[PDB]
Ligand binder design. Structure first.
Ligand SMILES: Nc1nc2c(ncn2[C@@H]2O[C@H](COP(=O)(O)OP(=O)(O)O)[C@@H](O)[C@H]2O)c(=O)[nH]1
Lengths: 336, 285, 336
């Protein structure tokens, strides 16, 4: 039951969210890593300054501040006890984005399995934000912020905060928390991997164009033009260049970590993607199978039904730059 | 015979109180805690004299029978002659000195079927039905008048191996009479440590050695139903092998780990080699 | 979270094992049904007679029975106390097959959720088999009997006994047992379904020939002739007739029970089965998708890539004969 070294996982998450030295931290487990980013990440913001969004406030005060609302004043007779219903703009850091940070930190402190120094620093910051109000967090809170007015930097830590909240489980005690065993589940790990590549390829493969391509079946049915019954088919990624087009389907399987029979069931999807897809340019059509392995990388080529297909692997756990080196080498060979 | 026993002092006293009362003790536990050694030394404790003659030790196996144990008719050159066994003869010595204590050691008693072996005598060997009053003519007794009576002096010690997965159920006949006692590995104990400290062992190697073994013992004992607590590794290998005065160090340790414990992990862990490889690395690495 | 009525499930299990009125029993849950078969099933055997297999016994007796073994006699000197080591054939019902029944019944009685009358009858039979020895059952015990010397009837109840043992979990009490929620898991339910059809089609579709067909990829790789890395591909069933060949791939999905998007991910396997398979006869090539639904049955046809493909469903929970009627109707249309 072998798994990836935890430090390497953080890099793929970064590309997934689209935005460093982790040698310093000694806690190998993820939450130690993840908290150190957040705990330090907030500190980066505070140096420049946290977001202050003007919240208009309509309240009853003993005097004129901003704009008086004449109606509520007369109806409540607040003139008599020397008060007005007035609208004015207090400037707070109490926005939804910043509130999430402090509320997220509470769970971070409450986590049972955590480095003490990390918990020490976090508890300091928790105190350092008195004005902001604690909250009981839900995904809908993160949902409201998908508008993304905030800076590019804020969206990073919030993406971190989203990962923590969804991957937080109460542990030994009712109050305390315990981290999810993220690596063990394949689906989210695979869904990470599928998303990891799509954003990664845009960065490095500037030469090529990277798109996820929706496809329509070549079928026609006398029954229905809709073909709703047919499976929805959307490529994981397509990486088109003028000389050659190329589709990749990548998934995380547990069997493959064992070096025997091979689990390539996803391949069955691939041919049908090649088939229904028709290029006007007619430069070429290629496919790739790429999986994560631990020890070593092996690359093969295939010529099956008029299609050029590759099976390849990467030895995650080696080193991130050499891993980064390997991927650029990989796509270059096949793309050519 | 009480200079260096790695076991805590509490249990060894508990047994002595238990032994003088019940007279039929079972010491369970993994192989490699010196069940023979502790019992052999314990025998001298109850007598108080480091005298071998009163003590005798026999190893049971499936084919061990009443004939070897007590009485049989082996042939001489011409005709068959009754031949006394061990236990029968053993008691004749004990009858001479009722004041003194005579002790019988039975290793791996669970393996054999006790009933075929003891037969008639299984009733008598219990502490209550002892003395001349409960004397019975033996199966091979030609004359009823000759009888066998278990004297009170006799104390019988049984050693049972917990380690086997093959074990399913303890024998009923064993359970009714004997008082089961479980021997912990006791890898983390002063006398074993101070013995090692007296030998050329630094405390870091001791703390390293004690630390790793405990985590291993807890792991196997933790998954109790799949694997018994008695599977957890003992300490006896580390005791012997230092007679030459060799310094115990990681150089010396790694042989014992790989030579002796490694097949034991292989038998215990027949499911996942990666799980074996995980724990073997931690012991040295 | 709707599931099949339990009574109908038993019929597909029967075809799976290849060998009735259940209106009588009032306990809808499966174990009530399953026990009634076994409890009555044993009674059917006893009327004709249970299997008696001669176990040779070599033991020490005071006289001649069968064949004396001279060696063990002299070596043990058993002549002197008037005994011999002799081999003879006691006739028992204590065989592995029959022992399994009684040991299986013990768990059946121990089950916490069970009809009382069923438990009453079973406890009677448990007493009625005194000679046979109780056992702690393992799959290896069933494994040893795959030779199948026993009659066709014995193999039925043992197949039942296998289902119980594998689908038995201890419940509230350490001793007592509680039945597995078999229906909820799709994989075994699907694996039932895949196996159900293969044996079923042999019975009813005598007109056609039914085979599971192994396939080899059309690919060639310069790297390896083996293509071990490639997925192993074995059809679920193939139902070949002289006029037309036809492949079926059937699986149980939870999404489909909801009448929306449709889960047809297995279809991706299907085309590649059609492609690598090449008929010398060249009569025709056809494919089918068939799934289980609860309410209703809907049949569609497709002409995709030169292949003739159908999507169809069956309303399990309707009635077994009408269900049996529906299947024969289904295969007939498409086969034609
Ligand atoms: N000095 C000392 N020796 C021990 C201790 N435990 C075991 N030994 C020795 O380990 C060696 C093997 O003992 P034993 O269990 O009888 O061997 P076994 O037949 O393989 O089980 C003997 O020298 C024992 O005396 C102990 O606690 N102290």
């Amino acid at each position: 039951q072998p798994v990836i070294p935890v430090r390497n996982i953080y890099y793929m998450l970064t590309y997934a969210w689209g935005y460093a030295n982790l040698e310093a931290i000694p806690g190998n487990n993820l939450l130690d890593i993840l908290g150190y980013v957040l705990n330090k990440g907030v500190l980066q913001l505070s140096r420049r300054g946290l977001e202050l969004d003007y919240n208009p406030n309509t309240e009853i005060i003993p005097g004129i501040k901003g704009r008086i609302e004449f109606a509520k004043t007369i109806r409540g007779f607040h003139l008599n006890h020397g008060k007005t219903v007035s609208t004015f703009d207090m400037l707070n850091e109490d926005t939804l984005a910043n509130r999430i940070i402090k509320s997220t930190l509470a769970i971070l402190i409450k986590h049972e399995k955590l480095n003490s120094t990390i918990r020490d620093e976090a508890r300091s910051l928790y105190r350092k934000l008195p004005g902001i109000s604690t909250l009981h967090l839900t995904p809908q809170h993160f949902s409201y912020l998908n508008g993304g007015k905030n800076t590019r930097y804020y969206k990073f830590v919030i993406s971190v905060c989203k990962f923590i909240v969804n991957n937080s489980i109460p542990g030994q005690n009712k109050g305390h928390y315990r981290f999810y065993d993220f690596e063990r589940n394949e689906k989210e790990m695979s869904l990470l991997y599928q998303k990891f590549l799509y954003e990664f390829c845009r960065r490095e493969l500037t030469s090529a164009n990277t798109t996820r391509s929706y496809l329509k079946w070549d079928a026609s049915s006398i029954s229905d033009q809709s073909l709703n019954l047919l499976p929805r088919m959307e490529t994981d990624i397509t990486i088109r260049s003028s000389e050659k087009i190329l589709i990749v389907d990548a998934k995380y399987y547990k069997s493959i970590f064992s070096r025997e029979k091979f689990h390539s069931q996803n391949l069955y999807q691939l041919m049908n993607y090649l088939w229904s897809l028709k290029p006007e340019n007619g430069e070429n059509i290629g496919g790739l199978l790429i999986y994560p392995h631990v020890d070593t990388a092996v690359k093969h080529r295939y010529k099956i039904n008029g299609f050029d297909i590759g099976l390849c692997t990467v030895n995650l756990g080696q080193e991130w730059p050499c891993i980064h080196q390997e991927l650029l080498d990989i796509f270059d060979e096949y793309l050519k | 015979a009480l200079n260096d026993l790695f076991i805590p002092e509490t249990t060894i006293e508990t047994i002595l109180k238990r032994l003088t009362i019940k007279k039929n003790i079972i010491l369970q536990g993994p192989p490699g805690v010196g069940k023979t050694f502790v019992a052999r030394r314990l025998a001298y404790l109850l007598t108080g004299e480091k005298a071998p003659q009163r003590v005798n030790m026999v190893q049971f196996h499936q084919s061990y029978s009443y004939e070897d144990f007590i009485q049989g008719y082996r042939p001489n050159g011409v005709g068959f002659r009754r031949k006394d066994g061990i236990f029968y003869n053993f008691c004749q010595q004990a009858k001479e000195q009722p004041e003194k204590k005579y002790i019988f050691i039975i290793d791996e008693i669970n393996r054999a079927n006790l009933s075929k072996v003891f037969g008639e005598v299984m009733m008598l060997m219990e502490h209550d039905k002892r003395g001349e009053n409960w004397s019975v003519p033996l199966t091979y007794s030609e004359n009823d008048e000759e009888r066998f009576y278990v004297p009170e002096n006799v104390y019988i010690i049984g050693l049972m191996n917990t380690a086997d997965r093959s074990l399913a159920v303890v024998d009923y006949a064993l359970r009714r009479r004997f008082s089961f006692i479980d021997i912990e590995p006791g890898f983390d104990t002063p006398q074993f440590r101070n013995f090692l400290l007296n030998k050329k062992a630094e405390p870091s190697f001791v703390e390293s050695l004690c630390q790793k073994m405990n985590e291993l013992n807890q792991e196997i004992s933790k998954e109790a139903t799949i694997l018994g607590k008695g599977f957890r590794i003992g300490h006896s290998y580390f005791c012997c092998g230092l007679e030459d005065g060799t310094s115990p160090d990681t150089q010396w340790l790694n042989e014992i780990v790989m030579t002796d414990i490694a097949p034991l992990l292989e038998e215990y862990f027949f499911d996942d080699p990666y799980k074996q490889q995980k724990w073997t690395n931690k012991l040295l690495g």
